[PDB]
Amino acid sequence: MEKVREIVREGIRVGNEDPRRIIHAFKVGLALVLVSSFYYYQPFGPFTDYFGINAMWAVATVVVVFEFSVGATLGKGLNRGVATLVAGGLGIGAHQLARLSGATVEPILLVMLVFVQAALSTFVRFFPWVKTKFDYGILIFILTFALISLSGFRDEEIMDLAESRLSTVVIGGVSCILISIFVCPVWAGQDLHSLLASNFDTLSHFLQDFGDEYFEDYKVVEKRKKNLERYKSVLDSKSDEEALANYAEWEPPHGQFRFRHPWKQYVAVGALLRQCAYRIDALNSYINSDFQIPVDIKKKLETPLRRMSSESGNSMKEMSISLKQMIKSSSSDIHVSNSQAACKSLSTLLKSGILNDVEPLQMISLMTTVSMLIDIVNLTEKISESVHELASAARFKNKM
Amino acid sequence: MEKVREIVREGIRVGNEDPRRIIHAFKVGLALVLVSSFYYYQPFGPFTDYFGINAMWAVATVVVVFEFSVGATLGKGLNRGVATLVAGGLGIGAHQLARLSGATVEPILLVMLVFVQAALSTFVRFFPWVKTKFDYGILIFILTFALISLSGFRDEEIMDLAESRLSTVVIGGVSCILISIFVCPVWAGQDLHSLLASNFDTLSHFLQDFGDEYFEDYKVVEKRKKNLERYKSVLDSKSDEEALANYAEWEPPHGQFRFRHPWKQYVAVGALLRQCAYRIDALNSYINSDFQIPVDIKKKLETPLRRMSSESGNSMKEMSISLKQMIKSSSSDIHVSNSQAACKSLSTLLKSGILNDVEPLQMISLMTTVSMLIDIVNLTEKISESVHELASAARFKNKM
Ligand SMILES: [Al+3]
Ligand SMILES: [Al+3]
Numbered sequence: 001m002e003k004v005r006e007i008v009r010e011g012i013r014v015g016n017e018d019p020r021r022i023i024h025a026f027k028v029g030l031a032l033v034l035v036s037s038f039y040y041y042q043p044f045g046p047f048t049d050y051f052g053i054n055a056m057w058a059v060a061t062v063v064v065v066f067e068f069s070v071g072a073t074l075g076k077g078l079n080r081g082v083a084t085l086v087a088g089g090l091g092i093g094a095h096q097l098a099r100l101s102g103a104t105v106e107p108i109l110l111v112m113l114v115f116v117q118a119a120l121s122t123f124v125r126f127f128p129w130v131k132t133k134f135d136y137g138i139l140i141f142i143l144t145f146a147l148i149s150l151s152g153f154r155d156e157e158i159m160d161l162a163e164s165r166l167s168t169v170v171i172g173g174v175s176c177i178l179i180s181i182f183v184c185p186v187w188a189g190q191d192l193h194s195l196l197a198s199n200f201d202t203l204s205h206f207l208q209d210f211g212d213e214y215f216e217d218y219k220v221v222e223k224r225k226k227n228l229e230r231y232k233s234v235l236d237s238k239s240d241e242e243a244l245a246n247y248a249e250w251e252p253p254h255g256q257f258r259f260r261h262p263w264k265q266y267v268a269v270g271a272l273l274r275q276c277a278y279r280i281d282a283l284n285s286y287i288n289s290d291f292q293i294p295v296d297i298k299k300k301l302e303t304p305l306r307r308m309s310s311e312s313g314n315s316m317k318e319m320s321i322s323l324k325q326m327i328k329s330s331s332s333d334i335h336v337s338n339s340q341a342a343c344k345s346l347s348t349l350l351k352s353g354i355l356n357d358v359e360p361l362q363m364i365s366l367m368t369t370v371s372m373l374i375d376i377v378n379l380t381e382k383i384s385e386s387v388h389e390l391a392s393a394a395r396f397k398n399k400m
Numbered sequence: 401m402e403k404v405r406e407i408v409r410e411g412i413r414v415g416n417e418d419p420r421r422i423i424h425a426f427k428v429g430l431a432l433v434l435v436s437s438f439y440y441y442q443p444f445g446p447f448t449d450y451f452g453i454n455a456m457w458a459v460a461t462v463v464v465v466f467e468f469s470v471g472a473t474l475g476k477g478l479n480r481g482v483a484t485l486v487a488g489g490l491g492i493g494a495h496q497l498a499r500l501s502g503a504t505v506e507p508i509l510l511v512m513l514v515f516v517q518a519a520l521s522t523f524v525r526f527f528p529w530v531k532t533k534f535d536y537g538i539l540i541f542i543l544t545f546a547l548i549s550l551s552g553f554r555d556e557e558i559m560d561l562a563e564s565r566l567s568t569v570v571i572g573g574v575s576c577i578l579i580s581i582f583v584c585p586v587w588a589g590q591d592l593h594s595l596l597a598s599n600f601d602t603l604s605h606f607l608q609d610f611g612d613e614y615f616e617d618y619k620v621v622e623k624r625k626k627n628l629e630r631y632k633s634v635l636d637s638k639s640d641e642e643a644l645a646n647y648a649e650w651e652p653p654h655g656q657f658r659f660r661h662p663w664k665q666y667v668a669v670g671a672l673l674r675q676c677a678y679r680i681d682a683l684n685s686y687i688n689s690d691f692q693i694p695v696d697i698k699k700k701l702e703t704p705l706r707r708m709s710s711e712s713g714n715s716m717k718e719m720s721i722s723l724k725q726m727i728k729s730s731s732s733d734i735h736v737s738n739s740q741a742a743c744k745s746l747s748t749l750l751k752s753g754i755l756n757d758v759e760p761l762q763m764i765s766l767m768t769t770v771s772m773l774i775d776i777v778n779l780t781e782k783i784s785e786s787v788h789e790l791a792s793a794a795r796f797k798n799k800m
Contacts, residue, residue: 014526025523029515036511036550056547063518063543111436115429118463123425126414143463147456150436239639278678282775350760360750364774367767374764375682 023184024068031062031179035172050164057165061172066180069188071250073180076136077173078250083140084169088162090117091148095158110149117145132246181252189248189257192266193323195240199273200320202230206280207313207376211306214287214369215298227284234277241270256326262393269390272383276376283372286365293362300354301366304346308373311339312380319387326396332384339377346370423584424468431462431579435572450564457565461572466580469588471650473580476536477573478650483540484569488562490517491548495558510549517545532646581652589648589657592666593723595640599673600720602630606680607713607776611706614687614769615698627684634677641670656726662793669790672783676776683772686765693762700754701766704746708773711739712780719787726796732784739777746770 015022039055067073098109121142245263253259315335322329415422439455467473498509521542645663653659715735722729
């Protein structure tokens, strides 16, 4: 009874985190009902020959092929389709040759050709190009060749069997793709777009909050969560960006997104934000340490550090705003030039010799923080140029 | 002809990088030949009822289940086995109930139970626990229930069909696992162990080379590769560590490794090395910059920075040596205490005021480098304690 309560509240939070998981769970069952009723009630005619010979394979296709995104099922469906076509042609050819050879060497020769192909294709599944794009196609290539060659049929039956396999894969895959595209779509390109703009938002949050909280019992643990967990969620999402980009390359043009859309540029901007998260991680550790400088030693540098941190935070905020609405923007340029002027003001402040009355270990912590902020300012200048190049590549609208 | 040359040399380098890919490609074809000859020649008797009714499903199982590691195929095989057992029992039960209800409502009630289960299981595939361990088991659960419920057989035939499905999954999976375990094994626990010791080695390489090359046309690009690519290979391997740990939790005890072996501690030590790679990344950027300090300004600090960097490099080297031979070691403690004494010597050197005749922008770069080295020294102290706790958890041998 107790673990029943735990699993129903776990289901409650999994559904509450994204409700499109509930709609995807209904779309899978709808595709199963649609495919099974097509092969049972047989609408236009009582099809025979290869049409209604096998119908468990259509349900196998729909269960395997359906996926949460649109590019995920389109990738699985197109891989399964072309692999079944090619391996079906090679399977009919293998049965022709092995029948032509002999009558008792025929199971021997067929199992040797299956050994050779499997070995050949299992080695090709370690190539990096085939690994990132078409690994499932090579698996279905092995599978379909070994189904057709190692069956116990003959020169007509094999032909019917190959056609049946090809036709039931096409019907199951097309039913999956039409329900995926036309009911409630979950585009992976929109999820990559939203994940990028959310990452910009969390970094802007830390920069403004560092501009305040650098110069100050459960509230300490609350702000500990609010600082640490956000940029630590940025660092652990290299893989999510990689996966959504591989899916979003498969999708058709929808809405605002053009047919050609630069997803590799999205992963490049994600990598630059991860470098900013490295520097933000270093700052956080120093902030949370126990060895803290006396506060007025920071208060003699409190002006241009506040200006640098706040203006780079506003630059990240304006870039996230311009990516959420897909426009070309020029607010980030003004907020970047202000941080550049603040860095030059700090460089003229440091020659004034205001740090000649300070212990050098405090100077170690102080010059670490100044170096981290200068690095983050130059990094946000790079991300501003890169987001501008992404905004011209995707042909964002020119409204502003 | 030209792309043929390109693909054969790509195959040459893919085989040369790891030759166990060639042996795995032979093991897959051997499992296909073994399974197909078992179902064709039918050794002990001409089995009937459920034994030789279906034999394409054994080859489907062997193609899908076989994987490069040992824990990978053991995970796929055990997931497929228990999912086929449970969904077979529920499928026979569903056909019993739907036959008991009516005679014309029976296809309607069967397709509604398939809709409910698919919806129920596709929602559970978003849980994080089920996602990291048993996602393929839930997929085979959907598949086997929908094969048994949506067939056109009746009260005896269904029973034979369920048993046949269960028996051919067990035979294909056991043939895969015995060839995987008993021919040439590729253990994923040994690959995680070797990947950890290699990561320690690349970090030790950078620390010694930084101790030399901090104080100095294609040779510049050569050492650019030799510095940059190593620690950048450390940073991009969070996922590899995660995947090999999930596989290595499935494996039986082999050789030196005990039945209980702490793979989560391996991923914890990998995370601490990734923090060291963050700090090493910051140092590299400064080293490669164009704004360089005049060299004698570094040469007045050249002594304890050399001692700190070299002793932490020797500590990483001794930890990698002790992890390659699986012993408990005490060389890392002496090499850590030397770096601690060097840090205190630097702290007494900085109070002497040798940095009062230097421009403060040069002091910014200098105090950045000193802060990075102090952070790396304290980090290697943490990794030394954590590798000691891993070395007692796994009960390494006490030879030294
Ligand atoms: Al015909
Ligand atoms: Al019987």
